């Protein structure tokens, strides 16, 4: 322990959340979760003070769903401090610079180091965000205004880590990453259905919310048949078919989320402890969706930055050609969903490649994650040996072999299945999209599975 010791004085200077005196009941853990997400939601509606012009094209638009970010607000960075600092912690632990340990004083030191790097990432990303050209020109903005925006994003990033740690310490129902990602996705879907925002294009005033539009169209046009057709088949604004597609995808993903292989196990050390070890089809809950989205979104940012500066280069053009900003050629084009059914017909190769990439990457990410997160059959077999658990119909030596048959298939096929559901949601035009809806369903199921876990104990 050499790296954690030198930064130890700098770790304790940040606020920490008190460990609960006793376990909080699930009733009040939901309430603190609701309070935590309410604070995050309020912070993501309050714009930064120093913004001069939010008119330029947004540079990080593709991570906004997976970073729980909102451009130009206090939640501009979103959960980026949590994701990046946690990544540095895993990379440092994986490469043996630091040790996570098990001593309560060592775990607190590990938490303090993660919080310290979250501030470093928050400050580093705040400067990068300012210099990207958003909020206006930094030279015209001024040193004081640019510094003030960094201060606002620094305290906001401190709040996110404080809110994230609040959920982890035992007051909430999980992590800030899962809660804040799902909260924005659920907020977006409800907004597309109930927003009172109205837009006029000449024909009249039309509500942006699909359900509000249906009631407005029926009343204004006196139960017109065309009003129902417009409410369901609206291309300019969200329509009811996209909402029905959203509900259909929710139902289908929920059905496959409940798929599980139930291993009948007994304990050999302490006899009488019998139970079921479930191997879910979605073995990796939503990591393949996050890993795929992060890979494509990060690749999009790199492609646009290289296209703007080093335009004309063959390698830059191969990485992606951009024409709002959407890919039209290069590698980034084949990683984007088809625009419409006509787009599939005119370019059948891109639709096939996108489906193959979406299924292949999610299947590959899922099977790779189990070899990193510690859910590989060898690591699960070791946990069985540590707890003395064996499978009913199999010998004590044949625990890893049976796990080798189920877990690698569950990860690879589960990632492929969760990759296909995102395509189906995208191809059906579901409000929420493929990544967002699948993220929302899987995160909510993690909260439901906590409820049944606490209920089963009682």
């Amino acid at each position: 322990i050499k790296f954690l010791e030198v930064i130890k004085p700098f770790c304790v200077i940040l606020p920490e959340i008190q460990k609960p005196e006793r376990k909080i009941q699930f009733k009040e853990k939901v309430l603190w979760t609701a309070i935590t997400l309410f604070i995050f939601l309020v912070c993501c509606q309050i714009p930064l003070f120093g913004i001069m012009s939010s008119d330029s094209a947004d540079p990080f638009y593709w991570m906004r769903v997976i970073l729980a970010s909102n451009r130009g607000t206090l939640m501009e960075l979103g959960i980026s401090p949590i994701v990046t600092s946690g990544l540095i912690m895993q990379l440092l632990a994986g490469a043996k610079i630091i040790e996570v340990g098990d001593t309560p004083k060592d775990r607190a030191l590990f938490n303090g180091a993660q919080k310290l790097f979250g501030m470093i990432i928050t400050i580093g990303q705040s400067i990068v965000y300012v210099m990207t050209g958003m909020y206006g020109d930094p030279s015209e903005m001024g040193a004081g205004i640019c510094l003030l925006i960094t201060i606002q994003l620094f305290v906001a990033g401190l709040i996110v880590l404080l809110l994230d740690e609040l959920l982890q310490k035992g007051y909430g129902l999980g992590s800030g990453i899962s809660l804040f990602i799902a909260t924005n996705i659920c907020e977006t879907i409800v907004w597309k259905a109930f927003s009172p925002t109205t837009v006029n294009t000449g024909r009249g005033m039309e509500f942006e919310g699909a359900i509000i539009a249906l009631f407005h169209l029926l009343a204004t046009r006196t139960d017109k048949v065309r009003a129902l057709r417009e409410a369901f088949y609206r291309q300019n604004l969200p329509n009811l078919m996209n909402l029905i597609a959203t509900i259909f995808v929710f139902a289908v993903v929920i059905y496959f989320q409940g798929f599980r292989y139930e291993l009948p196990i007994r304990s050999t050390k302490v006899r009488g402890q019998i139970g079921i070890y479930p191997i879910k089809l979605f073995y990796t809950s939503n990591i393949p969706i996050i890993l795929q989205s992060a890979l494509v979104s990060n690749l999009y940012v790199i492609s646009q930055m290289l296209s703007a500066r080093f335009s004309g280069n063959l390698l830059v053009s191969l990485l992606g050609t951009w024409s709002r900003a959407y890919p039209v050629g290069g590698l980034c084009y084949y990683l984007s969903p088809p625009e419409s059914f006509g787009s599939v017909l005119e370019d059948p190769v891109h639709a096939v490649v996108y489906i193959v990439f979406m299924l292949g990457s999610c299947a590959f990410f899922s099977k790779t994650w189990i070899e990193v997160s510690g859910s590989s059959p060898r690591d699960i077999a070791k946990q069985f040996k540590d707890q003395g658990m064996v499978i009913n119909g199999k010998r004590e030596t044949s625990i890893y072999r049976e796990l080798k048959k189920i877990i690698p298939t569950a990860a690879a096929f589960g990632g492929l299945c969760i990759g296909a559901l995102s395509v189906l949601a995208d191809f059906l035009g579901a409000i929420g999209s493929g990544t967002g809806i699948l993220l929302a369903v899987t995160i909510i199921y993690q909260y439901f599975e906590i409820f049944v876990k606490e209920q089963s104990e009682v």
Binding site: M63, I66, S80, V83, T84, I88, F117, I121, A294
Partner: peptide, 4 residues
């Protein structure tokens, strides 16, 4: 996304 996660870039240190």
């Amino acid at each position: 996304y996660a870039i240190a």
